[PDB]
Design a binder for these strands. Structure first.
Lengths: 96, 84, 88, 115
RNA sequence: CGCAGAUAUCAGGAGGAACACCGGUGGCGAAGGCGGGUCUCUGGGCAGUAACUGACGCUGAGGAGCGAAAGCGUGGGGAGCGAACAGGAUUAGAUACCCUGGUAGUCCACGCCGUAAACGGUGGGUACUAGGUGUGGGUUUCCUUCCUUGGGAUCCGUGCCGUAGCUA
């Protein structure tokens, strides 16, 4: 299947104690499609370049999914419709 | 010890100079993403604009992936653009 | 798009032997695959003129090959047409 | 009321120059302009007119209780640095200096060419 | 336009086109022409091996298809710009350049027309025919640290100088 580098930014009102599973709740839908080996990092509370909705910092995270395009676009649809994300983005790890 | 050019004492050296420089590929650079702000911001001006190849030294391949990652970084706000 | 395994399929079925690549039969089969795939692309993307030009070119070379094959032997020409289901 | 420190917005263009004071929050206290000093027409782009405008606005600021002032300069200014020097003479401490000039990232269309 | 509280300034919100630096004798495309970013679908191009088929090639009357901007039709949308139009102003008079306002139109979808300084003003294709010169792409031996506009040699694409030769 295809690899990606899904970036996500969330509000600081959440907490590190609860960051990781919030992603997992979404990611399970991919996990039950392709045995999708994931390699996830969490680093937040980082100052931004410019305020989004009166926020100085955000919660960064990098979810290296190895899955299919339908599934990643569906995941993006879910992530954006969620009420907490400030932003998100999906770069392809392969040549394009 | 020697001139900047015409130094037949040594091998034709692997040196970078005022006209010539190949700054990403050669050294000082780990991996080319928007996520690594520190390697990227070195290739900018003081005020947030972007440098030129004829001053830096890069090839268009390298300069354009640089610009790409810079611009993605500006959209994820890792790196500043200029605004009030 | 045309993957190496699709190429393996075509070169195994219509390819004379498991190695030939330049033969008219194999080349026509690959081009016909490519052309039906691209036609289905155009069903949706109606304005991809840069792709329709490539289509016309590949069709040109395909008719060239069919015509060469007919010059050589009409038997193999028509048997190829019959096997691919094509009309011309 | 009264305020000890503020900023000063200095809009300098081809046909006029208006220099106002403000708190750092954006609320203005007293402003002055080149046509308001008395000049008229095209007389009010020369930097002497900006000296005069900045002078009156700074003395109003003193009358309100301002001592230290930032500066935010905006536009093509015949008398930018003229105005700044006259401000710094007429009873003010120039804290911070900036070139805040609104540039668009190739946005809306500009008008045509003149002749 | 204001004096009914403008311009200026500051927070928020609405909005719809164009993407500063990267960006240039610079890349892609047959040509027109193409640059905010990410994804998806697709196309041609160059190089290396040159395994493979064995002259299938070149052109092309007609014909079909593509084709800037303006203009046409139906719907939506319209911030800025702006023909027409209105007013001020210079003027011999100014239906014009200047200023202030501003409609269609420019914008998206889908059907049209089929024109341009659509210009390298050089139709296409193949080969021979001094070099020097930057610059882009991929191979590769030599000084090799072997990290390099290293240099050499080959392939393609690109701009300047220059003999023969050609030209009014």
């Amino acid at each position: 299947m295809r690899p990606y580098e899904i970036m996500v930014i969330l509000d600081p009102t959440l907490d590190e104690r609860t960051v990781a599973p919030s992603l997992e709740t979404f990611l399970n839908v991919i996990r039950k499609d392709g045995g999708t080996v994931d390699k996830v990092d969490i680093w937040g509370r980082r100052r931004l370049a410019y305020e989004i909705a009166k926020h100085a910092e955000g919660i960064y995270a990098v979810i290296d999914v190895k899955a299919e395009p339908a599934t990643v676009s569906e995941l993006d649809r879910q992530l954006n419709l969620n009420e907490s994300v400030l932003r998100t983005k999906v770069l392809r790890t392969d040549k394009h | 010890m020697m001139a900047v050019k015409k130094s037949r004492k040594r091998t034709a050296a692997t040196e970078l100079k005022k006209p010539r420089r190949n700054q990403l590929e050669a050294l000082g650079v780990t991996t080319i993403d928007y996520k690594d702000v520190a390697v990227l911001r070195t290739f900018l001006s003081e005020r947030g604009k972007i440098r030129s190849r004829h001053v830096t030294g890069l090839t268009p391949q390298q300069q354009r992936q640089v610009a790409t990652a810079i611009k993605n970084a500006r959209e994820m706000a890792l790196l500043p653009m200029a605004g009030p | 798009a045309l993957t190496a395994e699709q190429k393996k399929e075509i070169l195994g079925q219509y390819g004379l032997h498991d190695t030939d690549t330049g033969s008219p039969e194999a080349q026509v089969a690959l081009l016909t695959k490519r052309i039906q795939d691209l036609t289905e692309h155009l069903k949706v993307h109606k304005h991809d003129h840069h792709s329709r030009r490539g289509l016309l070119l590949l069709v040109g070379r395909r008719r060239r090959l069919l015509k060469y094959v007919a010059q050589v032997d009409v038997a193999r020409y028509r048997s190829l047409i019959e096997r691919l289901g094509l009309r011309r | 009321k009264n305020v000890p420190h503020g900023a000063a917005h200095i809009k300098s263009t081809f046909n006029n120059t208006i220099v106002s004071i403000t708190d750092p929050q954006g609320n203005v206290i007293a402003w002055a302009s080149s046509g308001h000093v008395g000049f008229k027409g095209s007389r009010k782009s020369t930097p002497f007119a900006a000296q005069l405008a900045a002078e009156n606005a700074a003395r109003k600021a003193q009358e309100h209780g301002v001592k230290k002032v930032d500066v935010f300069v905006k536009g093509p200014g015949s008398g930018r640095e003229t105005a700044i020097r006259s401000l710094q003479a007429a009873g003010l401490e120039v804290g911070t200096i900036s070139d805040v000039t609104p540039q668009p990232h190739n946005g809306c269309r500009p008008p045509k060419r003149r002749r």
